[model samples]
Every structure is written in C-alpha cells, then in structure tokens.
Target: SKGEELFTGVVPILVELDGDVNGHKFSVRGEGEGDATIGKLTLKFICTTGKLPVPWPTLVTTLLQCFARYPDHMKQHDFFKSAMPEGYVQERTISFKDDGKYKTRAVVKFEGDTLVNRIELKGTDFKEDGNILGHKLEYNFNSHNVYITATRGTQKNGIKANFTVRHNVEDGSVQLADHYQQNTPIGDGPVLLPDNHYLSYQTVLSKDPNEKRDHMVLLEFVTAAGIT
Candidate 1:
C-alpha cells in the first residue's frame, strides 16, 4: 500500500501536432508536465524524419531569417512598440563554421525609456554536419536596470539541452528563475518557407494585475537573397 499511496496524486495530459508535408499527412504527439514553474511554459516538438527532403539546419536558418524582420512587419502590435523599444538595425551576419556547419547572428540597438538597449539572436551547431546546436537571445536592459539575463540552448540532434531564466534579485543573493529539459525532434519541412519571410511568434501575457506582465516579442527575419 505504501508504493501505491506514494504515486496517488499524479495525473497526465497529452499534446498533439498534426499536419501535412508534400502529399503526405503526419502527426507528432507526446504527454507529460512538470510541477515546477519553468516547465509550465515548455512545449514539445515531435515529427517524422522519413518524409524530410532537406537538412534540419536549413529549417533552423529559415526560422531565424524569418524572425529578424519583427519591428517593421508587426509595427501595429503593442509588444513591438512597448516591449522591444525603438532602435536602428545594427548588424546581421550569417556564416558557416569551419566544420561546414552554419550560424546566424543579428543584433539590434534601440532606445527605451529606461536606457539604450540591445537584443541579439544566434544559432550554432547544426544537425546536418555541425555537432553543436542551439539559439541564444540576450537583452541588456541598462546599467541600473541590469538584473540577470534569459537564455535557451538546444543540441543539434535534439538529444540534450537547457532553458533558463536568471535574475540578480539584489546584491548577494542570485535567483535562478526556472530550468528544464525536453526531447525535441530535428527534422525538415511542413517547414515555414516564405516567398518573403520574416521571423515571428505569437505571444500573450497574463491578465493578472498582481502578477508580472509578460511581453511576447515576435521577430520576422528574411534572407539577403529575398531582400531587394
């Protein structure tokens, strides 16, 4: 009775993603949820590899390129004006690492009520030929507003990775907000291919007044070839 009682309070939920690629229909699904705060926001991505024609890196690059154009495409959105601040394009670079893998990095510097800020997005390690894989996004709030930064990193093959949000609460005590792991499938297509693509994700903040307000920053990135 002891073992049964120990596991009595657990319940399970399932998530599914169904779509079509080419002429074939495919589905990816999984089930599990963590009791902690960070795991609440985590979502699983799963798909079949048999129908993929291109490499996983191609898909990753396409996703990043699409995100880079956020400010202009979604200018009407409040998050773009309020959360991201205003700034001019700094530098955008896409390069192939020595091992034949590729990566893209884009930095934007803008002025905010708090201070001059910068936002960066980068991808490394490719599933095709590169060993390392992941993306990192960093925001420098200001010297006075500096607390901590948030980062997300994933492996190329989707084997092992981490997501963390850190906060420098005061001076001595460093607070780690949340951390968790997931199994992600690295595959191609049903891919977000665009004639003129830019990166963007739909986000929503909670309505609770006592709770901290959340900002969903969506970026639309495009390629040099696509740009006139």
Candidate 2:
C-alpha cells in the first residue's frame, strides 16, 4: 500500500551560491581532496553533511556551469555559457533609481581567499536558471544555508523551488534558531531534526524596488531510514 511516496527524507545542506562544497568550517575545508576547489588545501573546498554522488574536484565546474555567469570573467562565462541550454542561466541585477535613471550596484560577489560565492539579494539582482548537482553533496552555495528563495519560482533543484533549505550546515543554526523550525519557540536541551528539508525563494525584480516578491518553497528532509 505505502509503496511509492518516495520516502527519501531529504534534508538541508547549508551551502552558498558560489561557495564551498568541501565545507568551510572552523577555518578550513572539512573534506577537501588533495587538490583545492577554490585556491588552497586549507581553504574551504566545498562540503556537505552527508556523502555525495559526484566528483568532488569538478563540482565547482558543475556549479558554475549550471547556476551563474561572470561578467568580469566574460571569456570564462562565454566558455561555460555556451554549454548551457538556450535561455538558461541568465543574469538579473537590482539597482537604485535616481531621477528616473538607474544606479550601478554590486549584488553578487566571489572571494577567492575565503572560498565562498556570496550572493546578496535585497530583491535587487539575480535570476536563476539555477539548478543543482551532487555528491560530496555539491549543489549551489545557495543550498549551503552556508547548505541552502523566490520571486515565486525561477531557480530549481530539478523538481521544484530553490531558496532556503532545512539543512543549515554548521550546527544547523538558522534552522535551529529560526522561528519556523520544529519547536517554533526556542529552548530545551536539543531537538534533533531530520535531514530532509529545503526551501526556495525566488521573485521577479521590478522597476519599483517595493514591487518584489520572494516566493518561497519549502521541502522536508527525506532519508532512506524506513524503506518499503
């Protein structure tokens, strides 16, 4: 009877849009391979809580290939962009308006030294064709709550939305502290949550900065604990 609901129990992974898969925790790449995903062995090499399914080293290549474009690295962007589907992985920036004109602003950034791709969105700039991959649990840094948005629905994890997730990496702080978490109100010794929650927040940017909508989607964790 209960044969096919896909009892996966998928959880959060706390990642960055352009950050580490080796997991930059306590000042070093938690599980980095001999090589570096960003710059050095000591640097965060991108990471996740659970085991992954792909090549650790090239996960960044997949991330870059799937979720972003580098205007500063136009040639590099062009090289990667060419491999994407038509109209997939586009850019959308947010800016202030002064006297009916637009102002330049920085929305996203990449820190080579820190090995993190930080994306700042105040309903300002960004658009996803943002997708996901795995192992070594390498998806997008956005997935990294260090592991995990929406205008409504732009970026995705292949099946649905793409903003926040249940897994907030290091000690799962956000998930633990967020009023939205299991207990709602904080307290008690510790409430162990499952590894099966994810969220996606996406919205459409408009001329009116106030006209933004961060449509969100939340997914519960799914594990192979009790199978059919």
Candidate 3:
C-alpha cells in the first residue's frame, strides 16, 4: 500500500528582475518569502553585464523605481563610489530575516579582492519604519497587500520623499497566467517577459532630469521543498 502526507513548510521564493535605466542594464534576484509571509529574504544584484554606472544605487532602488514612484535620492551625488562594484564583478548581498526579531544584513565584496564590507541592521515589527545601511525603509506584507517605502536624507539639505505602491498578489499572477494572449496588446502596460516567463513592468522615472528614462522590471518565482 502507498501512503501520502501533506505538510506546510518554508517556501523558497525566487525572484528575478531585469531592468534598464539611465542607459544601463541591471539584473537582480532574490530568495525567500512571497508577497505574504514573515520569513527570510536575500537579494543579489548580479553585475555580469558590466555596464552599470559607478556609485551604485541602494539595493532597493530598482524595486522602488519600478513599483513605487521614482525616488529623489537617485542623484549621482547621493551614492558613494566605494560602494559600487567594479566591472566583471558581483557585489552586495542584501538580506532581511526574522531572527527572533526582524533584522537586515548587507554584504559588500570586491571583484577578486579580499576586502569586504558588512553591515547589520535592527528593526521593529514588520510594519514599522527602520534603517538599512543609511537609507530609511518600511515594508509590510499582508494577505493581499504589499507596501514598501525607501528614503534617504533629511528635511533641510536633502530628503527623498516617501514613494509607495500597494497592489494585490493576484493582480500580477493573474496577468502572468494568460499565456495564449501573448503579444495581443501593446503600449507601456505590463508585458509578459519572454525570456523568464514573468510579467514585466514598464515604468518611467518621472523625476529624472530627462523625465524620459524608463525602467523595466521582471519578477520570477520558484518554490523549493524544505522542512521547517
């Protein structure tokens, strides 16, 4: 006789984002948790393309630009050259975890170099605003609600206002579910990314100097089996 059992465990959510902005291409991926859950997540910006500008934007810049509105802290002066990874290099591992409590870790590595920079952050509950490195961040995930706000600087000399976006989980997944409608509609709307079979968001940076810089982001999800 064959017997079967079903159980709930930690789901490994894999996310991939390919974006184009400021005339440069960027690829990023994340592991852990979905739009609804309290767990660990790690995001990596794979710099294999090698054309990303120096003085890189913070790890959440892509998401903020694509989902939330374009941020004010994107200026060249707002970034530091030392934090930027060089060509032919992969750098930075940003992580969020619920280790007894919520915490964040950022790791910076050089290409074929020995030096590394690591930073740890502490936060309140899942809904409160906190600091990551030098940026201000607040993200909360509920059943069908997802919201994130990232800002940098102060009210006097500089301050990146809060830009936020809230959407239901089913919206994106539903769009991705329609395969036969491929290439049926066109415009600046969401399009199914052929390469990874994910929905791509075509967003424009309204705050950019040119006001014409468009950012495209694709997110992919993969679940892995594991025991809690």
Candidate 4:
C-alpha cells in the first residue's frame, strides 16, 4: 500500500461558495514567484498540471487531517463529516472559481529530513505570472500539528500572522490559536467547535482582501457507498 500512483472515484464533494461581489479563484500552487515555507518543515513546489481549482493552506490542512484519520483512503462525503467528527469549523472549502482579491499557492514540508514529504498538493505552488503577488503562507509539520507563518503581500513583511493548529483524533478537535509571529504580540479568539463543519472563529485566512473578491485557498472528489 505504499505506492499506487493512480486511482479514480465518484461522489464529487462540493463546498458551496457564497458572496455578492469579488467572487473566488483558488490559488494554482506552482513556481517562480511561487510558494515556500521555513520551519520544522521546509518546502518548495511545482505547478500541478491541469491547473484545477485547488485551495492552498486549507487544502493542506484538510489533507493532513484526512491523511491522519482516513488510512483506508476511502473518499466518502460523509467521511468529511466523520473526519472532523466534530465536523469542520473552517469553510467546508475554498477555491478559484471567481475573482479573489488575494490568492496564493504554497507547499508543506518537515525540516531536518534530507528529503521532504511533498504532498502532491505539496507539489502545488502559488506562482508569479503577471499580477501582484501577496499573502504568502508557509508551515512546519512534525506529524500531527502544523505551525503556520504567513506574509500577506510585500515580501518579507516579517510574518504578518503566525498560527498553530494541533489536530486531535480522540475528541475530534483542531485546537487553533492565533499568536504573535516571532512573539511580537499577535492575537487569538478561541478554538472553534466543528459541530457544523464550519470554522466559527476563523479570520487570519478567511478574508475578502476587500469586498471585491472571493476568499481563495484549496480542492476534491470521492466515491463508493453509492458509486457509478
């Protein structure tokens, strides 16, 4: 079960996008003017071919959570509910379907390992084509938790936001807290309860950049229980 390379499924999982203006456009996770992270994990990415709408960090977060809980790799929509048992407090999803004011694509890595574990998603990048690039997010993952360091626009603004999330399989809780980046007095509200698959207290990553765009960031598909 180590390597399979390819597979297929049905029951496409869908996350409804709601907004009046500014729409959404998931980041394309790619290269040059691309994405990277420095910490317990260091990573760099390449543009995943096909260029579909795969949300960034949220995808990373969702992937890891799924990876840890769904060892069988069974892609069930309800599993989405089961994965978080507590359900998800964060948006069920985010992507590039509209005009996102700020969008980016980056990778996930673990430091000290001569080789990095780049999820195919890790294989995703934010890219730098011709528009203004801002809001860069990077993280460190040891195994279960991911420490996030982000720079929103204007390279090297010194980590605009630093976030920490530790997923617990026992009670189905992802303890998320907002703290000072580099310990410079940042902030926090409280960990959210996932009883409804929505992050009731998320902000650092959920924004319109202005009332002019959709929140960009992650992707998906599924199968079985009632497949074609």
Error of 4 at 18 (Å): 12
lDDT of 2: 0.21
Worst 10 residues of 2 by lDDT: 176-185
Tens digits of per-residue lDDT, candidate 2, 99-178, equal 11111111211223122222211221211211112212222223222111112114221111122232223333322111
lDDT of 1 by residue, 120-140 (tens): 333333334222222121221
Which pairs, if any, clash in model 3?
Answer: none
**Best of the two (3, 4) by TM-score:** 3
Error of 1 at 207 (Å): 37
Q: Rank the candidates by TM-score, best first.
A: 3, 4, 1, 2
Cα lDDT computed for each candidate against the true fold: 0.24, 0.21, 0.24, 0.23
RMSD of 4: 19.5
TM-score quality measure for candidate 3: 0.23
RMSD of 1: 20.9
**Tens-digit lDDT string for candidate 3 (1-228):** 000000012323333445433234455443332221212222333343454331122233222111111122222221112122321111222223321121233333223322232333332333122132222322222121121222222311111211222211222321001011101111222221111112122212112244233322223221211112
lDDT of 4 by residue, 12-74 (tens): 122222111122232323111111110011112222333323333434342212221222222
Of 2 and 3, the candidate ahead on TM-score is 3
* Quality of model 4 by C-alpha lDDT: 0.23
lDDT of model number 3 = 0.24
RMSD of each: 20.9, 21.7, 22.0, 19.5
